[PDB]
Design a protein around this nucleic acid. Structure first.
Ligand SMILES: [Mg+2]
Ligand SMILES: [Mg+2]
Ligand SMILES: [Mg+2]
Ligand SMILES: [Mg+2]
Ligand SMILES: [Mg+2]
Ligand SMILES: [Mg+2]
Ligand SMILES: [Mg+2]
Ligand SMILES: [Mg+2]
Ligand SMILES: [Mg+2]
Ligand SMILES: [Mg+2]
Ligand SMILES: [Mg+2]
Ligand SMILES: [Mg+2]
Ligand SMILES: [Mg+2]
Ligand SMILES: [Mg+2]
Ligand SMILES: [Mg+2]
Ligand SMILES: [Mg+2]
Ligand SMILES: [Mg+2]
Ligand SMILES: [Mg+2]
Ligand SMILES: [Mg+2]
Ligand SMILES: [Mg+2]
Ligand SMILES: [Mg+2]
Lengths: 177, 135
RNA sequence: GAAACUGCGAAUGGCUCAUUAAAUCAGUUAUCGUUUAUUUGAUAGUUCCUUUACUACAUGGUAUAACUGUGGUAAUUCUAGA
RNA sequence: AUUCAUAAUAACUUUUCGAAUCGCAUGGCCUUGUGCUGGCGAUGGUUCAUUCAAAUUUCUGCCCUAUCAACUUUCGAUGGUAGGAUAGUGGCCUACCAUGGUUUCAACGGGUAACGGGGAAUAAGGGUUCGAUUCCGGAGAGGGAGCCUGAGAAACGGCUACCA
RNA sequence: GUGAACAGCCUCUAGUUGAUAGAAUAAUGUAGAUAAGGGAAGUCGGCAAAAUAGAUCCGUAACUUCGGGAUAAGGAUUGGCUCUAAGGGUCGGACGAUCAACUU
RNA sequence: GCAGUCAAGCGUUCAUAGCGACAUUGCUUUUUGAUUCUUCGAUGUCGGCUCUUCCUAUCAUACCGAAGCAGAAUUCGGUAA
RNA sequence: GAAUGUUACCGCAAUAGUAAUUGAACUUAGUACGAGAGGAACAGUUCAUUCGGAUAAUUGGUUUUUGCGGCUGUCUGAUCAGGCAUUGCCGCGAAGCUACCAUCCGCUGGAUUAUGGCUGAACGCCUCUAAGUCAGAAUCCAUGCUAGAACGCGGUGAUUUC
RNA sequence: UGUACAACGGGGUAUUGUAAGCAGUAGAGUAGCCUUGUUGUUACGAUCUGCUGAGAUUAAGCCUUUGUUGUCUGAUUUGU
């Protein structure tokens, strides 16, 4: 199967392809959230720890934490939940969903790195990726800089440069509260 | 090869053992032997048959090892760039201690104090014009 | 100003005449027998606490979409992990 | 016409509401703190009234039929008490108790190629026949049931199950 | 005792324990049981077997000599325990005392 | 009951691929008759059930030769029980 | 099972018996053939039918395991625990037996028949036949399989003091 | 006279489904008696819970065995 690995310290991610039943099999009967020590899966990932988070079987149905089961089942789903985005106020749909227990019926495992191993993984540890948007509400700026209700925000807000060609500009949020 | 479990007794079923019933709906049932099979047919309730996993669970028989198993952990690490912020801008920014902040600060804080009262007199300006600005 | 959140609407309209014979329906009554978004008019000095070494009010908490990125399925307004 | 409106006492409450919201203006006033004040109006908010509704409900009125005469209490039929449930009255439902309720002034059952009304056609008058169908009311969304959302739906260009 | 019972089953009194015996447990028998799935395809023919069955409450067609048919058919129920209520007698003037049953 | 010989005819034409009249030679003994040898001081009827074996005049199956055998299907025939 | 000195172990094989059967699907192929309509087979593959010989992991049947439990009626003063009810009745039930109701296994060489042919006279031609000869069937004979002649046999061990 | 054999015992394997005994502010309740109930007690009560996947059975054609105990020359024939 294909592994979907995220390094959420850097905000990085890359996919990996494992053929070899014995290399995979380490993931079997493991549930969502279980940790998995790395070396078993490869020599690259030696030491690395993975917390499983979800992923898809063939036919593409998403896993859903909490089901248990290594099979698929059809559930009534509601507002505020995984694997369902409601079309209408108070709409519920009965939908197929995959169990949270890993089997070889999965096209893709979704892992999140919890501990770094002894060696670097290129697109993941080597590369590092900027947090798209900065604090907008007053006291969140105060916190992301540690400030006191003294320091005055305005000159602490983020300032994003972007060019008109020969006119390079500067846009900041609009503080709230 | 899989070990199924007896759906009346919770017993381990190894390949070849017992039987598999397929009900009208399509609920599949597996029995490990003809005892569980029979008790199922008599419409017995596993929860009241004492040798079953189900009864044993419902009566807190056993466990003890589970009320003993507790703890374990390990966690964390460090820092990644943000695009328009290399780890270096992030070191440089973070590092600089209060007295440069106050410095920087009270400079700008005086610097545009000038701009404010300047624009203000600018108002009265386009207004002693606009309470004039004749023929 | 897209997307998305939030709010409101989708219980109106339109269509048909299958059921239905004290039912519906009509004229006439009743709520001193109740629910009522909205519209319109009014309507809120009291909230803390063994009650001097105070309690963010110059204003307290995180979690999420969209998004970024990694993915699954022959296939849907399917959606998962980060 | 009330145990009405309203109020008073004692308590009760996984405590309802009592604005941590938005837009325009920027002005007064000193003990000069960016002090304390302050214009127009938006969206909210509790309770009452109003309006748009709704739900039940009184009195009278329906086509053919006796080759339908007794009907109603399996498994509420008619009433009493108490409760539960409902937005709320009520056998609506449940307990207990009673033996009631309708009928030749046609009950009950059957039929209807029956939705009801405003109306239509036929012109001496009295009638006779018709009304699926431009307005009002009702019912339904292939057939049944169930329910989420919500002020309001037992909704179908909503979901859920079963049947076709 | 159970129960409707002089039934069946178990008991007391009384009476028996007598009808060659030992060791095995092949076939085939005689007598007694049971069988997955199917359900009379077996057979002259359901022969033989099997299925039903007591009681309480519900319900019950054609036809008929109006008596029947009828336990038609078809259904629910049934243990143990702990309670509730109702159903008599006798004697002293609407009660009062005393005695005694089981059944619903 | 079964099989031949002749070959007039059938078979568009062509006797004999497949058939075959008039006649004619046979074979069989699960038909039915004819007989009355055995058994009337006894040989227990019909059908079925069950089970074994034998015959071949072969329905299927193996390999072949014919055809009015293109293919498919058939039909005639051989060695075959 | 007596008798061939005794007793034992390992063997031979005369004779007799003998067994396998039939179908389909995939592929060949929408091919050969055919105007079309239609429409094969050999090799290779997977299954099945009828038969046979075993076997009991599994599943199922059987139950005096009277093995455990439950139940009615009575009897042992009660309890405990038991008797009787022709095995009292019910649920489960090991083992054994056992079922196309379960699973496994069922061999490969030759020689021939019909027939088609080779060479080839008789008959200087011709001819599968006369001499000689090739190929050839669910046939036959062997391989294999079962008994083993109690008057068929081989090889081998030990052969008596009380 | 043994790496023997047997009877028991032990362990394993099975079957059934939780023994007896004790205990319980478990139990629909009813009925007595009292100091009349911040848990009143006494009698009776199917059943329920705990000790308890307990107890019983397990070769009779199951497997095993460092234990205990016992056994170990009776009869008859046979020769080239
Ligand atoms: Mg805001
Ligand atoms: Mg704000
Ligand atoms: Mg919205
Ligand atoms: Mg949260
Ligand atoms: Mg000002
Ligand atoms: Mg408002
Ligand atoms: Mg009432
Ligand atoms: Mg009410
Ligand atoms: Mg009555
Ligand atoms: Mg009456
Ligand atoms: Mg009338
Ligand atoms: Mg109609
Ligand atoms: Mg109308
Ligand atoms: Mg009408
Ligand atoms: Mg109509
Ligand atoms: Mg109305
Ligand atoms: Mg339609
Ligand atoms: Mg609906
Ligand atoms: Mg539509
Ligand atoms: Mg609609
Ligand atoms: Mg229907």
């Amino acid at each position: 199967m294909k592994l979907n690995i995220s390094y959420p310290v850097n905000g990085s991610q890359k996919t990996f392809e494992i053929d070899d039943e014995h290399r995979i099999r380490v993931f079997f009967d493991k549930r969502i959230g279980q940790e998995v020590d790395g070396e078993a899966v490869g020599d690259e990932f030696k030491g690395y720890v993975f917390k499983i988070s979800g992923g898809n079987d063939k036919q593409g149905f998403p896993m859903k934490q909490g089901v248990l089961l290594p099979t698929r089942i059809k559930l009534l789903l509601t507002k505020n939940v995984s694997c369902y985005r409601p079309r209408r106020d108070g709409e519920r749909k009965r939908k197929s969903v995959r169990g949270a227990i890993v089997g070889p019926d999965l096209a893709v495992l979704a892992l999140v790195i919890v501990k770094k191993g002894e060696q670097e993984l290129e697109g993941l540890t080597d590369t590092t990726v900027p947090k798209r948007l900065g604090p907008k509400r007053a006291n969140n700026i105060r916190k992301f800089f540690g400030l006191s209700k003294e320091d005055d925000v305005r000159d602490f807000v983020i300032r994003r440069e972007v060019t008109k060609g020969e006119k390079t500009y500067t846009k900041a949020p609009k503080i709230q509260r | 090869m899989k070990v199924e479990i007896d759906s009346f007794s919770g017993a381990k079923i190894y390949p070849g053992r017992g039987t598999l019933f397929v009900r009208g709906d399509s609920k599949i049932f597996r029995f490990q032997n003809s005892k569980s099979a029979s008790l199922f047919k008599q419409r017995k309730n596993p929860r009241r048959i004492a040798w079953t996993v189900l009864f044993r669970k419902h009566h807190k028989k056993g466990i003890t090892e589970e009320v003993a198993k507790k703890r374990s952990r390990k966690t964390v690490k460090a820092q990644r760039p943000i695009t328009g912020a290399s780890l270096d801008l992030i070191k440089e920014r973070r590092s600089l201690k209060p007295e440069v902040r106050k410095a920087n600060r009270e400079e700008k804080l005086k610097a545009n104090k000038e701009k404010k009262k300047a624009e203000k007199a600018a108002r009265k300006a386009e207004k002693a014009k606009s309470a004039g600005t004749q023929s």
